[PDB]
Design an enzyme around this catalytic site. Structure first.
Site, PDB file in Angstrom:
ATOM      1  N   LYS A  17      17.673  71.202  19.173  1.00 45.03           N
ATOM      2  CA  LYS A  17      17.395  70.351  18.009  1.00 45.03           C
ATOM      3  C   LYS A  17      15.885  70.174  17.775  1.00 45.03           C
ATOM      4  O   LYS A  17      15.419  70.294  16.658  1.00 45.03           O
ATOM      5  CB  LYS A  17      18.054  68.958  18.164  1.00 45.03           C
ATOM      6  CG  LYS A  17      17.087  67.779  17.835  1.00 45.03           C
ATOM      7  CD  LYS A  17      17.740  66.384  17.778  1.00 45.03           C
ATOM      8  CE  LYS A  17      18.203  65.906  19.168  1.00 45.03           C
ATOM      9  NZ  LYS A  17      19.543  66.496  19.520  1.00 45.03           N
ATOM     10  N   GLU A  38      11.179  62.649  18.939  1.00 44.17           N
ATOM     11  CA  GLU A  38      11.643  61.808  20.039  1.00 44.17           C
ATOM     12  C   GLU A  38      10.450  61.043  20.596  1.00 44.17           C
ATOM     13  O   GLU A  38       9.418  61.651  20.896  1.00 44.17           O
ATOM     14  CB  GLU A  38      12.292  62.639  21.148  1.00 44.17           C
ATOM     15  CG  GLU A  38      13.720  63.010  20.797  1.00 44.17           C
ATOM     16  CD  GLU A  38      14.497  63.635  21.931  1.00 44.17           C
ATOM     17  OE1 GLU A  38      13.876  64.190  22.877  1.00 44.17           O
ATOM     18  OE2 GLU A  38      15.742  63.573  21.839  1.00 44.17           O
ATOM     19  N   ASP A 117      14.030  63.178  14.547  1.00 51.49           N
ATOM     20  CA  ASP A 117      14.680  63.570  15.781  1.00 51.49           C
ATOM     21  C   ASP A 117      15.572  62.421  16.263  1.00 51.49           C
ATOM     22  O   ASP A 117      15.110  61.516  16.960  1.00 51.49           O
ATOM     23  CB  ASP A 117      13.629  63.915  16.837  1.00 51.49           C
ATOM     24  CG  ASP A 117      14.169  64.819  17.907  1.00 51.49           C
ATOM     25  OD1 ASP A 117      15.262  64.510  18.427  1.00 51.49           O
ATOM     26  OD2 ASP A 117      13.581  65.864  18.294  1.00 51.49           O
ATOM     27  N   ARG A 118      16.843  62.464  15.882  1.00 50.12           N
ATOM     28  CA  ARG A 118      17.835  61.422  16.214  1.00 50.12           C
ATOM     29  C   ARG A 118      17.822  60.232  15.256  1.00 50.12           C
ATOM     30  O   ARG A 118      16.792  59.896  14.684  1.00 50.12           O
ATOM     31  CB  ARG A 118      17.715  60.937  17.675  1.00 50.12           C
ATOM     32  CG  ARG A 118      18.006  62.007  18.700  1.00 50.12           C
ATOM     33  CD  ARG A 118      18.046  61.520  20.138  1.00 50.12           C
ATOM     34  NE  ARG A 118      18.316  62.614  21.089  1.00 50.12           N
ATOM     35  CZ  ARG A 118      19.513  63.159  21.298  1.00 50.12           C
ATOM     36  NH1 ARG A 118      20.579  62.724  20.621  1.00 50.12           N
ATOM     37  NH2 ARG A 118      19.651  64.130  22.190  1.00 50.12           N
ATOM     38  N   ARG A 175      16.659  74.452  30.889  1.00 54.07           N
ATOM     39  CA  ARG A 175      15.798  73.340  30.486  1.00 54.07           C
ATOM     40  C   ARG A 175      15.261  72.580  31.715  1.00 54.07           C
ATOM     41  O   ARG A 175      16.007  72.286  32.654  1.00 54.07           O
ATOM     42  CB  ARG A 175      16.547  72.399  29.523  1.00 54.07           C
ATOM     43  CG  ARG A 175      16.046  70.964  29.501  1.00 54.07           C
ATOM     44  CD  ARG A 175      16.961  69.993  28.777  1.00 54.07           C
ATOM     45  NE  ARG A 175      16.429  69.674  27.456  1.00 54.07           N
ATOM     46  CZ  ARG A 175      16.445  68.472  26.896  1.00 54.07           C
ATOM     47  NH1 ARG A 175      16.974  67.436  27.529  1.00 54.07           N
ATOM     48  NH2 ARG A 175      15.920  68.309  25.693  1.00 54.07           N
ATOM     49  N   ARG A 177      12.913  69.099  32.371  1.00 53.98           N
ATOM     50  CA  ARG A 177      12.323  67.913  31.741  1.00 53.98           C
ATOM     51  C   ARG A 177      12.163  66.797  32.765  1.00 53.98           C
ATOM     52  O   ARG A 177      13.135  66.440  33.426  1.00 53.98           O
ATOM     53  CB  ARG A 177      13.210  67.402  30.598  1.00 53.98           C
ATOM     54  CG  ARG A 177      13.396  68.371  29.455  1.00 53.98           C
ATOM     55  CD  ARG A 177      12.154  68.587  28.604  1.00 53.98           C
ATOM     56  NE  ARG A 177      12.480  68.757  27.186  1.00 53.98           N
ATOM     57  CZ  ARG A 177      12.936  69.881  26.642  1.00 53.98           C
ATOM     58  NH1 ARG A 177      13.135  70.964  27.387  1.00 53.98           N
ATOM     59  NH2 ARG A 177      13.192  69.924  25.345  1.00 53.98           N
ATOM     60  N   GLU A 180      15.000  64.287  34.312  1.00 59.06           N
ATOM     61  CA  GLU A 180      16.355  64.707  34.014  1.00 59.06           C
ATOM     62  C   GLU A 180      16.936  65.382  35.244  1.00 59.06           C
ATOM     63  O   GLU A 180      16.227  66.093  35.951  1.00 59.06           O
ATOM     64  CB  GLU A 180      16.372  65.679  32.832  1.00 59.06           C
ATOM     65  CG  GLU A 180      16.363  64.984  31.478  1.00 59.06           C
ATOM     66  CD  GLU A 180      16.461  65.948  30.310  1.00 59.06           C
ATOM     67  OE1 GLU A 180      16.797  67.139  30.504  1.00 59.06           O
ATOM     68  OE2 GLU A 180      16.183  65.508  29.187  1.00 59.06           O
TER      69      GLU A 180
HETATM   70  C1  LIG Z   1      18.373  59.105  22.816  1.00 60.60           C
HETATM   71  C2  LIG Z   1      18.800  59.120  24.258  1.00 60.60           C
HETATM   72  C3  LIG Z   1      18.485  60.191  25.082  1.00 60.60           C
HETATM   73  N1  LIG Z   1      18.881  60.186  26.358  1.00 60.60           N
HETATM   74  C4  LIG Z   1      18.524  61.263  27.280  1.00 60.60           C
HETATM   75  C5  LIG Z   1      19.305  62.574  27.247  1.00 60.60           C
HETATM   76  C6  LIG Z   1      18.225  63.615  27.248  1.00 60.60           C
HETATM   77  O1  LIG Z   1      18.245  63.935  28.624  1.00 60.60           O
HETATM   78  C7  LIG Z   1      16.888  62.941  27.073  1.00 60.60           C
HETATM   79  C8  LIG Z   1      16.561  63.168  25.589  1.00 60.60           C
HETATM   80  O2  LIG Z   1      15.266  63.714  25.448  1.00 60.60           O
HETATM   81  O3  LIG Z   1      17.132  61.551  27.181  1.00 60.60           O
HETATM   82  C9  LIG Z   1      19.576  59.089  26.888  1.00 60.60           C
HETATM   83  O4  LIG Z   1      19.924  59.111  28.091  1.00 60.60           O
HETATM   84  N2  LIG Z   1      19.882  58.023  26.119  1.00 60.60           N
HETATM   85  C10 LIG Z   1      19.539  57.980  24.833  1.00 60.60           C
HETATM   86  O5  LIG Z   1      19.842  56.995  24.137  1.00 60.60           O
END
Ligand SMILES: Cc1cn([C@H]2C[C@H](O)[C@@H](CO)O2)c(=O)[nH]c1=O
Ligand SMILES: Cc1cn([C@H]2C[C@H](O)[C@@H](COP(=O)(O)OP(=O)(O)OP(=O)(O)OP(=O)(O)OP(=O)(O)OC[C@H]3O[C@@H](n4cnc5c(N)ncnc54)[C@H](O)[C@@H]3O)O2)c(=O)[nH]c1=O
Lengths: 318, 301
Positions: A17, A38, A117-118, A175, A177, A180
């Site tokens: 996205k 984001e 973005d969202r 990916r 990040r 994560e």
């Molecule tokens: C928008 C959002 C993203 N995320 C997470 C999932 C993705 O790993 C990362 C998004 O960039 O953050 C959440 O856990 N909660 C949320 O509300």
């Protein structure tokens, strides 16, 4: 009186996205298309420290039985408030600028296009709902969030992503990040919720009344079954009064959900292609989308200043 | 023309005589939407008071207290937020005949979405970023939002809090002073904004017509260093939240109820206060019927 197009690209993480929206914006103009990214620096620095890490660590510790459900829930709920703040604030300062339906559909070109973005519902509904499915949030808290979703104004175009599970797993496994953790169960949960979301909007637009169909809950296109919508997630013993009825506070939260989703225009974007393919596919989807008038003549520059300021301050740095 | 509605939110610090007063006034076209545990929550109130105690003793960290208070406030807010969201579509523009219906509410959403979060911030158990997230979620302020706030000397307020059992609660005088200060600043803030105050113009006065000094408003709380860049400027995300605060509070009509009298006088004072309150029209002929239906169904639980 100048027109505005707003486009919120949303759905499960890991589909491409963020790339797609940037490529679209790059197709030029600068004075008439702007990206609202984001808010990574909010999540990682301004609102709290490394919220993303906090989220995945909290689920990991729950999975390993190192913390209880209740303790996971309070951390997750609080983290989700941090996650949603920039979205909520943006929506709140934008709202009074947004006027009536303009058309796009056989209308001229927008004086401004905002690509988000969202949408607020990502952090206020979808991720909380997925975390509920993951055992790290209660359904009561999810409905608490729902009750706080801001009114959905005209021209709320939501683009949701489609991608085969197998390609999506592959995309996530590549990916990397900060903070994560690879969680394929969370992937499944978030894919499901966004599937339900799409179905919910169709259900409501087809004249669906969740109160009419509530007893049918057990275990483009035609009318979906209520069991294929988000309503199916909230028939859970914790929310049910001693008679199988939903407590009224909870039923009203679901009424709010219906009022928030029904006005949305949903579009499905296929992410199973090249970055440039995803861009041009998105481009085609936008031409038909609903525009709005703005409420003041200085509305356009103000909106433009808001979006660019947001991007500079909260968009990924370094 | 559509029938008229009067909405009255009885708010302010806990422990002043809110419920007694309201119960008395209603005992006489008038409907009470009372306090919601609400729907089976694990006594949130108990966890709130226990968490602050554990914090004050150094048994848990600031961060640990903060996640509990934030999650707790979401839970506490829900009944008011859901009530507001379903009523909103029925609210029309300001009218000025007696109202066809008077709704008396036990609290406004700002209590759980602003006032209590801000008091916990002052108590070191919430981040200011979380408080501003709740601010960003305050529903748009409708026409005819009349909020009644209490006046009570602190010593008598303490007596009143001590007078009755409160399961899960701890008498906390620092919290009491904090919530009292917050509500005091809320009233000053509304006056500041109604007088044309611009927090952005006045912001520099925190570093050193007629209206309160910004230093005597809610804005002073948000000079919190967590919200500031290395050069001292407020981040735009937080500044936008303050613009939102301004737009939520300026439209409100604030009425002060003296609780420093007998329950009868309180009841009577409250009734006296309604003559100046702002009524609205409803949006449909069926609105009053469905609002009374919504208030009755709410009353059972
Ligand atoms: C928008 C959002 C993203 N995320 C997470 C999932 C993705 O790993 C990362 C998004 O960039 O953050 C959440 O856990 N909660 C949320 O509300
Ligand atoms: C909304 C919110 C609340 N809370 C906290 C604060 C509280 O600790 C608790 C419940 O909050 P509540 O507002 O739902 O209700 P309560 O705090 O239980 O009490 P209220 O404020 O609703 O009413 P009162 O405590 O004033 O009720 P009342 O019983 O009428 O008054 C207390 C005593 O005084 C006497 N009294 C009443 N009127 C009197 C008078 N005029 N003179 C002398 N005495 C009077 C009564 O007999 C009683 O003994 O939760 C949060 O932490 N976060 C939040 O977001």
């Amino acid at each position: 009186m100048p027109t505005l197009l707003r486009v919120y690209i949303d759905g499960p993480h890991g589909m491409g996205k963020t790339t797609t929206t940037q490529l679209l914006v790059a197709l030029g103009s600068r004075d008439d298309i702007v990206y609202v990214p984001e808010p990574m620096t909010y999540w990682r620095v301004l609102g709290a420290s490394e919220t993303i890490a906090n989220i995945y660590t909290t689920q990991h510790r729950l999975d390993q039985g190192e913390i209880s459900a209740g303790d996971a829930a309070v951390v997750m709920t609080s983290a989700q408030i941090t996650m949603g703040m920039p979205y909520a604030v943006t929506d709140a300062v934008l709202a009074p600028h947004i006027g009536g339906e303009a058309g796009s559909s056989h209308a001229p070109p927008p004086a401004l296009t905002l690509i988000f973005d969202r949408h607020p519902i990502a952090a206020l509904l979808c991720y909380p709902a997925a975390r509920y499915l993951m055992g790290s949030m209660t359904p009561q808290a999810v409905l608490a969030f729902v009750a706080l979703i801001p009114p959905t104004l005209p021209g709320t175009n939501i683009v949701l992503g489609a991608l085969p599970e197998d390609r999506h797993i592959d995309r996530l496994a590549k990916r990397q990040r900060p903070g994560e953790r690879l969680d394929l169960a969370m992937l499944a949960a978030i894919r499901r919720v966004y599937g339900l979301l799409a179905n919910t909007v169709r259900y409501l637009q087809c004249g669906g009344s969740w109160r009419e169909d509530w007893g049918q809950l057990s275990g483009a296109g035609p009318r979906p079954h209520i069991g294929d919508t988000l309503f199916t997630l909230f028939r859970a013993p914790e929310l049910l009064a001693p008679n199988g009825d939903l407590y009224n506070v909870f039923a009203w939260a679901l009424d709010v959900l219906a009022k928030r989703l029904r006005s949305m225009h949903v579009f499905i974007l296929d992410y199973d292609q090249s970055p440039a393919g995803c861009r041009d596919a998105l481009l085609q989807l936008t031409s038909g989308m609903v525009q709005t008038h703005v409420t003041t003549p200085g509305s356009i520059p103000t909106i433009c200043d808001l979006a660019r300021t947001f991007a500079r301050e909260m968009g990924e740095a370094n």
